[PDB]
Amino acid sequence: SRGEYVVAKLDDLINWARRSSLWPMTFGLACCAVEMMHMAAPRYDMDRFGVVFRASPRQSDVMIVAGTLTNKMAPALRKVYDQMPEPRYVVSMGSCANGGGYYHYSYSVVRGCDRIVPVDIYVPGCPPTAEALLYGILQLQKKIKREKRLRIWYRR
Amino acid sequence: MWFEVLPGIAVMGVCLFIPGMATARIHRFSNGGREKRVAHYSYQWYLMERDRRVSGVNRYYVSKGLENID
Amino acid sequence: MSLVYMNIMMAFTVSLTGLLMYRSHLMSSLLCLEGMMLSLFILATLMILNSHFTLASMMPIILLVFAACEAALGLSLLVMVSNTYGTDYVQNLNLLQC
């Protein structure tokens, strides 16, 4: 049908616009934020791919959990994720933001950021290098590209 | 290198070339191939109204020359 | 007279009855003062431009200058009030009743 082709092309267009204009949030906690700034360094140059940091959650696309999410910090992270407009993606990077890392058995460490916020991409390492984080960003772009929003809306 | 800032800037040049000249082209289309006459002072407006009345077509840019008189 | 004269005079009377009944706030009265000044300016320049009195065109703008000669002054009569009390209510200005 022609309507299926139309909604498929529109879905491709909006996925291209959303995946080529990722706006992360300036939000770091620990070592992995230093590696994120080294991904923002002139060598790797995230702004080539349309990735540009934005300070406010209201004008941001994704959130990169870079560091250790402790017990005193989790409500703040949850509120910051809640304030972001849809569609919203979370990239968990580093061992601390994945499963607690070095501090899995600590009393005041949340064992992974999955317990607080939904996570799209898990980036392993301590720290995962700027090349690895750029690879995770490109993997997130590939995941956004194969979204099927308008096709499912036409099917539903 | 640096010269790759020159394509997009060039597009900006086109984006700053289109409007203004278009107004001139518009000013060369409505006013019959001449500039749009300016009326900063009331004497110029009175001359504009006299020309519009004397053209006979209710268009001030229709210029009647010395062949009109006897 | 004309019609716009009636409307500007009605605006002046509206701002006058806005000024004369206070609503426990000094800034609102200052805004009413500025509105009456604006209405007087508009009426004066309307009459002057209608009657072709060119040499009186110095009148309104100069008039407008003296607007600040009270209006900004009113603000300088507020900050001490707002240093005397935490707010700028006109019911706090009742110490001179005895």
Partner: protein, 175 residues
């Protein structure tokens, strides 16, 4: 109904005056005074005084901006009233608009009204002059004659402004 353009602008002028003279909150009073100044400069610009309208627009925009800074600083409330948060403010705004539109309807019916003076109902376009003004606008030459003729006015105005500056310094001192 384009011949009554100045009348319509004056209707919006009194509408804005009713809007800010009901005193809801000085933010929205400032917005109403900005709207009133805009339509007033439109009126006087329609009468030919473009310089005077632009000048009063600029002056009142600057004054209202300083006022807004003051009310944000000093004259504020936990719950400001927009127009309907207070019964008295909404009520007096409604009766102001009702009186204005009643006067409009009465003057648009028999083209004559008696409020204390006597007013017509025709548009103001009748009272214009039919001749030209040469190579100058009268209002520009009139205000430019402030320096060639009005030496006394310039002297007293400059002295008043300097004394005003000194007065502002002296009042807000504290000791």
């Amino acid at each position: 109904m384009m011949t009554y353009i100045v009348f319509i602008l004056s209707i919006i002028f009194v509408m804005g005056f009713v809007g800010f003279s009901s005193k809801p909150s000085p933010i929205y009073g400032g917005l109403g005074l900005i709207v009133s100044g805009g339509v007033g400069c439109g009126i006087v610009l329609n009468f030919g005084g473009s310089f005077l309208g632009l000048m009063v627009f600029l002056i009142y925009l600057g004054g209202m901006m300083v006022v807004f800074g003051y009310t944000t600083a000093m004259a504020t409330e936990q719950y400001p009233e927009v127009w309907v948060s207070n019964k008295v403010v909404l009520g007096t705004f409604i009766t102001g608009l009702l009186m204005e539109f009643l006067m409009v309807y009465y003057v648009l019916k028999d083209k004559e009204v008696e409020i204390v003076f006597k007013f017509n109902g025709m548009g103001d376009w009748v009272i214009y002059d039919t001749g030209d003004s040469g190579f100058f606008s009268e209002e520009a030459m009139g205000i430019a004659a402030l320096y060639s003729y009005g030496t006394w006015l310039v002297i007293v105005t400059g002295w008043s402004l300097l004394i005003g500056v000194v007065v502002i310094m002296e009042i807000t001192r504290g000791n």
